[model samples]
Target: HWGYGKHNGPEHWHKDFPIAKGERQSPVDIDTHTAKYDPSLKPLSVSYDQATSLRILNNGHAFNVEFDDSQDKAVLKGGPLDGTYRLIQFHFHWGSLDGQGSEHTVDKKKYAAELHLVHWNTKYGDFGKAVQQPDGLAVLGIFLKVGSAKPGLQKVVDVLDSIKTKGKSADFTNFDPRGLLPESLDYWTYPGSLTTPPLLECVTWIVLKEPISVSSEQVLKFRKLNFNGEGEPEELMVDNWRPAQPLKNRQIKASFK
Candidate 1:
């Protein structure tokens, strides 16, 4: 219902989704110079079984890599999160132009793109139920830079050719998302919400300080996806990211000194 067009984009979503104005809205600018350094933060523990990766889909907004989150085989722990958060799906947000897109900006600097790995707390039962609670979701945000060709992402990029239209999906397996992450585990932590509509205020944001590299060609292949289905007018699936929300005096803690 909410499309990122000139009329019904982020600015107008509040008409239908009141939570868009919720104080814990996501994609906030991570200003490191002023971020509090907490010595009690633990190192992030991320371990995913490659076989848990299921299908890939062009869900109109972006390409999503769904995972078999039926079990705790693939889980994220440590850091600021308290119980295990099982991986459900992962997706990307990019721009219509270079050096833009990415939901969260660092010091007001936008990157080429951003990747979100969505996970939900098992304590809340299922992904559907978890989203409604205060401590329900924990997302890992990795910024994408346009530079060297990321061999780890080639498998994902290769499948884009097949699912170029909205609602199209294909089987994708044996891909370890960990390989797409930067070597550093250092990050910024804050309380935030889903960047999209129904903007639930229930995610503990773990945004990595380092970014992974992707080639310009790889970035172009992603843009080929259409927001509309085949036979419908082709609407380019780019710039589907939400702008940074206000911090509202929330404290962002740094995981590293």
Candidate 2:
């Protein structure tokens, strides 16, 4: 298994998953000046129904908010996607301190945190099968900056108390995950993969340009989550983000100038 630690960290991931050394890895640094702005890029269209939210769980990595993606309840369309992609789950990657957690950086500048809303193509058989194909997944990456408290984010922070330890889960619903998004949908996109282990190159990443605000206190709640289960030596689930991988031959496209 892979983890963000001294022994099993990103540097050592290649030993287990040869794909970790693959060409198209994720969390690549974005240079706005070098990213070509495409005037023809379509606007990001997303629709979410809170009733579809199943539960929120701490999977020993990040607190994942899973949705009922059986149907087209919550979906993302347009923005470099061929078809509609159904929202399955969303999670976060953060560091032990502010200004050091985000996975993808902007001109080498790291944000306090990063949010990954994972979706799968409806054309695919299932999430499992989709992971194998190139055009099977689409992920929305939102950067979180340290600033005033975001009431919408607090809603997520408030729930962290219930799922503090690994494998812990609680019934979470009626919360519109869409509120977490920034006002501007303008974004940068590229072909990438799951930042974590079993890093498959199936994701069409739509990284939003506008960064959302989260207070220091709100980020502290995230740090409270434990990577280890109850009674085990508590490993605070911070800095769980993957380091920025090599961009290789991929091109980053912007939706706006």
Candidate 3:
């Protein structure tokens, strides 16, 4: 992520994650010709019991729920018709100094923020270390829009107050990750790379087509959160999203006719 400085935004990401430049980026503008449906894509499955056991960690980068599937309370899985996977880390993607924050761009437009449901292949091994392998990860993308209709994501937003200060978070015990998925399973899939550091080439991207709604006020609240270690007051830490990156030769698919 770019720091709160001049000319230090996504353009600066390559400095930390050089592979990020070569990696297949996301939030591509959906063109009927480029992003058609693929019936063979697999549907995601979630075992709520297996997911709740993961520990929620906010290493100052973002709020992430780490998993120990062996003791994991939930076992959520899905993919590009490849195999059943398991939940690993759940994080959010957002924009900076603007009104939107999503990695994937539809028709060259940005959304409020993007919710990523990260999972990994169980065959390869548990998620803790599998993150180093390319095939070990799968990401589910949920788009957000600013409006009156509550996106249901507010439940997570509700906690921002508790973590208003940077690098601060409350114990996230007993929360259900499955409750985050949109009612419609229909999604767009493709071969892509990770959005974060190491920029690994091991992710099957699945983005939901429908956009979830959030109030303009809620959207503003989300953008006001800051992870920077600056000793500044908890003033406006929102706007923590990345802009759309180049597609870089990736094949994006979906589940539809």
Candidate 4:
């Protein structure tokens, strides 16, 4: 199984998933000095229906809050996108310590955590099919910094106890993810792949420059989750973030100057 351990970690991923060394791989370091400002990039438009939130689950990789995408009740448009994309789920990548966790970093600086709001192109019919096309997915990445407590994050932290192990899940509804966003929507856009295994190079990555705050105490709660299933040997689920990949020849565009 692909996991955050020495035996099955990111270093060993390329052995089974050859695309790990692909040109457009994600979580690249955003060098502000090199990122060019794009005058044509539009402000991201996100419309979410709180009722669309269904449940939260620990998929042995990270904890994700799944949404019902039967319709366009929750969708994303604009911001380096060609068309509408349906919001399917949102998950987080964190670390065992406060200094490093985020997947995408600025000038090689890491944050406490990172939130990925995964969406799929509506034109592709479904997520499974959309993931195969180059313009199939649009992921909004928000960095999380350690600071004062944020009530928006407490909602997710409160439920971590129920899903303490892999394969565990619970009903998580009526949660408006917008509360977790920062005041500014400034972001850097790039062509990249999913940071995890089966890292398909199909995502239009929009990583927000403004980071939201979450208390260190609340972040520690996430570490309580186990990588193993209910009966297996206990293993903490921390440092669940992939290191930054090469930028290759692709350009990183910023929405603001």
Query: On residues 3-78, what C-alpha lDDT tens digit does candidate 3 reach at each position?
Result: 4334755567788778767756544666546786666656666566545533555445566755655544555455
What's the CA RMSD for each of the models? 0.9, 1.0, 3.0, 0.9
Tens-place lDDT per residue, model 1, 4-95, is 88988899999999999989999899998989998888879998854389899988788899999888978999999898999999999999
lDDT of 2 by residue, 62-142 (tens): 899999989888999998888889999999999899969999999999999999999999998589989899998999999
Per-residue alpha-carbon lDDT of candidate 4 for residues 1-257, written as tens digits (9 for 90 to 100): 78889899998899889999999998899999999999988778988754388899999999999999889988899989989999999999999999999999999999999999999999999999999999999999999999988888899999999999889999998888888889998999999999998999999999999999999889999989999899999999999999999999899999998
Candidate numbers, best TM-score first, in rank order: 4, 1, 2, 3
Report the error of model 4 at residue 97, Å: 0.4
Structural similarity to truth (TM-score) of each candidate: 0.98, 0.98, 0.83, 0.98
Cα lDDT computed for each candidate against the true fold = 0.91, 0.90, 0.65, 0.93
Best by lDDT: 4
Off by over 4 Å in 1: none
Which candidate, 3 or 4, has the higher TM-score?
Answer: 4
